[PDB]
């Protein structure tokens, strides 16, 4: 079970890597905007921070305005040449799935993102995408239930190597739901991971055990 | 999981093969009528388009007026001699199942089509048919629920090699249903496959990510 | 169980009313475009065709470009003054739900349309909308399963009078699904209703009964 | 729970009425052919046999070649004028459902027969048909499972008065299935009803009780 | 919930009536054989023991060799004239169900016994039998599962007044199964009822409570 | 999945073997009576018809009046010496199970027939019977549900080699039920197998495809 | 699946071994009391009857008054020295489980009996008991449902070698329940096994087949 | 299935090890307080009692006031140097999970305790903790249901080596629940284990068997 940090802040990426053993980092144009640093700067820092680190995937989304699979393959080839840890994140669109098939044929790892149905997840798997990111939070915010188990079951039934990254996770119960389904990776913000490791009953027992220790020689 | 294009139009067969990685093509007398070209012409084009292509099955239905298993075996032998990619499509009738058994004994791949029950699907499997096409859409149009899981389970329980091609699919949710069942192949029209790759929430997120990219250096 | 004809063609509305006993008619900007007649013309014809007919709701969508609840209430008040059978169809948006609450307070029947979740369906019910149209087909085309039972159950549990019109229906099995859920109305095109009344086994039995009648004095 | 005798033989109709308390009789063009008597003769006998008997419905199918709802309404009006116990049986076709609506409007009881889906059963219910006959045996002979519970549930959910007559029953377990569903009537041949009343364990116990009676004063 | 004593011994019938509040008594030719007294003697004793007792049904089976419904109605009329508490027990056979219908029409209460299927139970209910006795033990002895819930559900769905007497019960868990189903009456031997009222954990607690009482003033 | 023809008519056994690929033939004293030929004659014909054919089991029931396991072993040894394809069919009785154990010890294949419970099926499996025939139709005719899955599951859980032959099958849906359970063989009459291969929707599609072929060059 | 005869009568042990292929014999102080012979006599007979027979376990319970694990190990060592087929049966008590652990360490096979919960069954399995006998009948007589599946599942999940002997079985349906659960052995009285092999429908079919044989040359 | 004694009393640890075959011992600051001996004394006794014993884990919780992962690693390193059987028990806190990762990297076995959710259990598993103790009793005392199966399933799905120790167990039914889930170890007090081995029906049968033994030679 892999825990990828959904963050573009290197103070949180450094902490989670040294204390929580994160297995990777996913970013989106909104996480880079909230970074406050320019996109190319965030990339240079991520490339140096994990220069030697192997098996540490760093998903980086290309220009979201790209509408042609040829323009996406040219932009994502440049970003991928900046670090061997970088995985080009492409939206699940006609030209994104065409661009993700060309990328995977050239050996550039791709993360087909913005997948909201098991039918949108199967094509990324048929073209050999390294990762497929099915989003949960967004659909829930609009009163929809969250097809995650279907994707895991389909991927397994047809022996697909594509690794599922359940995204838009907002609480540790949604981490439990992804783990109970059999999802390969779960991407979450730093605070979702911290709170998931904490429980009120752990503080209750700690107080009961701290009272006992004191009433003991 | 194989995606066969249920079309007799070579502009859609060429596109789907180069961009969607279709694994085969299924046709019926109605798809050839809608082609606007004569049957033998459509066949010559399909034979040349995929002359060398291997592992690209092209299901072609014989004369639907054929009532004798001897007349079907003579007509389907001629069609099969036109290309090594051609798979003779035979209706699930007494003389069709007798003709499909003789064909399979002579090494001519057969696709027993128009199967609407798991009892009609088991005989094609007992005679070594290469493919069995259980239809879904038709029964649904007449208010019937769609036995697909039963066929998959029976085929698996008795280790049958016949590959199930769920046919008459009209939406990507019916593609999800076939994949969740464990069907080997799903045959669908070009537009059913395009829409199955698209979602409104992908366009919503794309707009949110395009706004962020713009408010970023 | 009400069967509303999802059509803007008066040859199909007249036939379905005299032969199928349709209980109402729903239209959308795309059905009026396919009519080939101007919007106001379609309305004048519908107003005269059912001038006296009572209990025959005719859902008519207002300008889809309207972005303010004040502009929607002014446009839908004018359309509603054209016939007592007309029910203003408003999209499930912030300004649509604000405009549907003002309309319902003035006694103008409203059909809150484009609802794709049970959370989007509950607010229309809390403001006293006459109808709420949850769409099925669209979500299915994008590989999503179709929350219809949840809306029926919620509406029932909280004794809401809003009538549910399952929309975007494409086959008679989806009519069976809405009826099995307990939906009040189902809106479908003329051809979806015709095919739903037909079955191959009815033609099989008819042939067996026609052979018997002939072999009988 | 009503038990209608699916027979055109008056020796079996007379016996079942006096010993099994049958509540009605259903006939089809094939049962009249097997009678060996002309159709009008069978009708005259049925009309006299139950001249006074009230609440004894006798379903009689009109010419199966009738293709127009006007020709069906003229033929079924004549048959209905032969006895007040006669219920015109009409096939679930476009012109049959149009003819069944006109018949029911004139007060002639109709039994919409050859219904093989819950979508084909709902229209007969919307037009006020007295009876709707969903067939089971035929679909089973072709390897299909038998939607009967759906029709019962739909009819109940929407408070329909149409009475469901499960037809083509071949064994007492299928009578148990219809009764467990809540079907109003079950139509079966004389032999299906006799065997349904018998069990091997009743003959076993009878032998054990006959041995005890003998070893007792 | 009624508890009928399945016994022909008046020492056990007297005890169960005064201490367990039995609501009735069922007997079969084998229980009368095991009585050791002649049939007519057992009847005279039962008639006097409960001469005035009202609402105390005493099921008495007629000659098990009777093969004609006319001979059964003559024999059961004589037995029924011996006491107003006597209920003629008739086997679920063609002539038994014909004889049970004639008996019920003359106002003689009948208990259609030896019923081993829900199809054999429905006819007794359609003819107004006072009681129907579905047997459990026999089928279980031959490795069959015991349709009891189906009969209860059918009887309830069709508002039948016939009271179900689950028979051949051998343990209190089978009494629990009949009560959980909703059966009206359960007939069991004296020892099945005694053991059903006892539990090892009641003797365990009694010992714990007897030790406490002793260690208390 | 094996399809054995439950017939004693060699015109139907020859056809089913050459066109349907039947894997064996089962017969009972009633099938031989309906043959119209003497028992020994039917056997001589079956022995010559399949003289060389290997792996073609021909189940033949011994004298049904045999009451001793010694008399059954002497009669079934004689019948088994008439052909190597013959499998002695013995009833599931005390002396039948004793005779089936002696037969199996001498290397004579036995088919323990007339099994109506999973407890009656387990003993045949413990003594190494080659086949066990659980009957379905009979129990259904008496309103009983049909323990078939239990036998399949028990046989599998305890790794038994005995092959289950679901018998008394009357429709292709009961063939689907046996295949869904995992039964090894299904024995059915010639007409049950023919109708199981046919569907009304296959004739509907055939007509739609025959109309298209005609409106095509 | 092993069938052990729960009897201390050697006429029934000899018959069941030669005709039913019993795999072992279980006895309790009550079965030896009902034998009418002294305990040591029953043991001498059982030791000689199966002197050479290998793999024929003969469970023999030690003095039920033994309260110390040391006294049980001394008494059960003596009984075990009388025959290599003897398996010391010890009650599931504190001193019984302590005595069963010492016995199993010395290589004396033990059958921890009187187990009525899955928690009482797990300890016998943790100490390497050869057999654990969970009782069913007793709990049922006191209206309790019968944890048997839990023990089978626990034993399997933790790869325990202890073989489960479902005891206190009273009918063949309880044999079916133990086999459906996956129990290793089932111990039952001679009559429970005989009746489990018999069915009324086997006698019905036998009569139908005996009538056919007679009406045949 | 391992049974660890949740006790700090060496009279109960010695007994359970020699008679119940306990596989380990877990202690908490409250068990050491109830010991009445100083913490270091309890440790010295446990270290000598099991000096040579291998594979006998002795979980010992560090100072519950420790708030830094550096202070926990220094205190738990000292305790671990006292015996090779000692396993440092650390609370599931941010600094506890950081301290448990450092400990496991240095080869010191750790038992991450006070886990009350499957999200708090997954991180201990990702850092290679030897044991994870999910608590049940506490949550139940506050009216919460007890996620134990989820942890077992997650651990299994992702092939984690961490062994689950279900803690705060209060009865043998909660031992059955942990065993039915597939938990590796269950830690319980001495009295929970004794009562789990006892049943009232074992004392009932013992009395029935003691009466029989007496009425026997
Ligand atoms: C990439 C998917 O692999 C992104 O990081 C994703 O957008 C979302 O996970 C998060 S959020 O909605 O922006 O919070
Ligand atoms: C062949 C089956 O393998 C055909 O292509 C099939 O008819 C249907 O898939 C499609 S449709 O109803 O004609 O659309
Ligand atoms: C109104 C809803 O009440 C409309 O008629 C609706 O848009 C859809 O039902 C149909 S479609 O997708 O345009 O076919
Ligand atoms: C009328 C329906 O109400 C008929 O009697 C019906 O056809 C079938 O019930 C019977 S069969 O297939 O002809 O046996
Ligand atoms: C009457 C049914 O109402 C009888 O008493 C019945 O036979 C059985 O209940 C009992 S037994 O098998 O004879 O024990
Ligand atoms: C043998 C079983 O293996 C027989 O052929 C069997 O009796 C039945 O299958 C058929 S029927 O009831 O006689 O139709
Ligand atoms: C031994 C268990 O392995 C005995 O034989 C057991 O007591 C019971 O099986 C039977 S009964 O209750 O005494 O009938
Ligand atoms: C250690 C967990 O592995 C402890 O022994 C634990 O606290 C609890 O099991 C018990 S109690 O609540 O203190 O009884």
Curated annotation (Swiss-Prot), chains A, B, C, D, E, F, G, H:
Catalytic activity: 6-deoxy-6-sulfo-D-fructose + D-glyceraldehyde 3-phosphate = D-fructose 6-phosphate + (2S)-3-sulfolactaldehyde; 6-deoxy-6-sulfo-D-fructose + D-erythrose 4-phosphate = (2S)-3-sulfolactaldehyde + D-sedoheptulose 7-phosphate
Keyword set, alphabetical order: Carbohydrate metabolism, Schiff base, Transferase
Disulfide bonds: none
Enzyme Commission code(s) on record: 2.2.1.14
Induction behaviour: Induced by growth on sulfoquinovose.
Enzyme's top EC category: transferase
InterPro entries: Aldolase_TIM (IPR013785), TAL/FSA (IPR001585), TSA/FSA_arc/bac (IPR033919)
Role, per record: Part of the sulfo-TAL (or sulfo-SFT) pathway, a D-sulfoquinovose degradation pathway that produces sulfolactate (SL). Catalyzes the conversion of 6-deoxy-6-sulfo-D-fructose (SF) and glyceraldehyde 3-phosphate (GAP) into fructose-6-phosphate (F6P) and 3-sulfolactaldehyde (SLA). Can also catalyze the SF-cleavage with erythrose 4-phosphate (E4P) as acceptor, forming 3-sulfolactaldehyde (SLA) and sedoheptulose 7-phosphate (S7P).
Sequence similarity: Belongs to the transaldolase family.
Protein's name according to its UniProt entry: 6-deoxy-6-sulfo-D-fructose transaldolase
